[PDB]
Amino acid sequence: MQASQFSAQVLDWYDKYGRKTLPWQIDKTPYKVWLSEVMLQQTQVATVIPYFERFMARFPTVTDLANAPLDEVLHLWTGLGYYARARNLHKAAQQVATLHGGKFPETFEEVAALPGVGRSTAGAILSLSLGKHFPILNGNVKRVLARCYAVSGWPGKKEVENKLWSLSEQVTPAVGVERFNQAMMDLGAMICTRSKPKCSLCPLQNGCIAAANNSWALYPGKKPK
Ligand SMILES: Nc1ncnc2[nH]cnc12
Ligand SMILES: Nc1ncnc2[nH]cnc12
Numbered sequence: 029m030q031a032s033q034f035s036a037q038v039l040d041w042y043d044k045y046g047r048k049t050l051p052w053q054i055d056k057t058p059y060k061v062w063l064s065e066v067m068l069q070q071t072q073v074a075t076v077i078p079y080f081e082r083f084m085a086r087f088p089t090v091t092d093l094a095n096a097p098l099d100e101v102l103h104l105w106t107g108l109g110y111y112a113r114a115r116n117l118h119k120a121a122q123q124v125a126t127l128h129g130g131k132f133p134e135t136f137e138e139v140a141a142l143p144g145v146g147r148s149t150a151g152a153i154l155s156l157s158l159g160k161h162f163p164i165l166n167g168n169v170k171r172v173l174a175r176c177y178a179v180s181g182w183p184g185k186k187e188v189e190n191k192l193w194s195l196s197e198q199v200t201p202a203v204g205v206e207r208f209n210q211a212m213m214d215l216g217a218m219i220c221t222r223s224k225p226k227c228s229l230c231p232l233q234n235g236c237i238a239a240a241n242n243s244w245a246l247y248p249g250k251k252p253k
C-alpha cells in the first residue's frame with residue numbers, strides 16, 4: 029500500500045477505535061502535551077494519569093512549574109521512576125519561563141532545544157497540540173513502521189533510524205496530523221505489541237509485510253548480537 033492509503037486507514041481506525049478521552053487529549057496546549065509526553069515515555073498510561081492530574085492541579089502553567097522548588101517537583105514525581113526526566117522537566121520549564129516569557133515555544137527548533145525533549149517528542153508536542161506538520165518516531169511507532177515496511181536492521185544504527193524517519197515522514201499527513209500521530213502511538217502501544225501483535229485488530233493488516241509473512245519477530249532489528 030501507498031503512503032496515502034496508510035494514512036487514510038490509520039485515521040479511519042482512530043475515528044472508531046482510538047483513544048480520544050485521556051486528560052492530555054482534552055483542551056490540549058503545548059504545556060499539557062509536553063508534560064504527558066515526558067511522563068509517558070518510560071511509564072504506561074494507567075500509572076501516568078494520577079500523576080498527570082496531580083501535576084496539572086499543582087502546576088496549572090509552565091511558570092508555576094518553573095518557580096516551584098526542584099525538591100517539590102521530585103517529591104511529586106515519586107513513583108514514576110527515571111528521575112532524569114523530572115530534572116529535565118524542571119529545567120525545561122525554567123527555560124520556557126526565562127527565554128519564552130512563560131509561553132511554551134511553538135516552533136520546532138525552540139521546543140527541541142528544551143532539556144529532555146528530542147526530535148520525536150518535539151514533533152509530538154507541536155503536532156498533537158497545534159496540528160503542526162511533524163512526524164513522530166518513538167519505540168512503538170518504530171515497531172509499527174518497521175513491521176509494515178520490513179525494515180530489518182537495528183534502529184540504533186544511524187542509517188536505519190534515518191530510513192524509519194523517512195518512512196514516518198512519508199506516511200504522516202498534514203491534514204489530520206494530530207489524530208494520525210496519536211493513532212500511531214495507540215497502535216504501537218496496544219495493537220502492534222513487542223510480542224504476539226494483534227494483527228487482526230490492526231488497520232494496516234492488509235498491506236503490512238510482517239503480517240503477510242508472519243515475520244513480526246524480525247522487525248525492528250535488535251542490537252547485534
Ligand atoms: N500521547 C501518548 N499516548 C499514548 N502513548 C503514548 N506514548 C507516548 N506518548 C503517548
Ligand atoms: N506483548 C508485549 N507487550 C508489551 N511488552 C512486551 N514485551 C514482550 N512482549 C510484549
Ligand code: SF4
Binds near residue numbers: 171220225226231
Ligand atoms: S498488521 Fe500486525 S505486525 Fe503489521 S503493523 Fe499491524 S499489528 Fe504490527
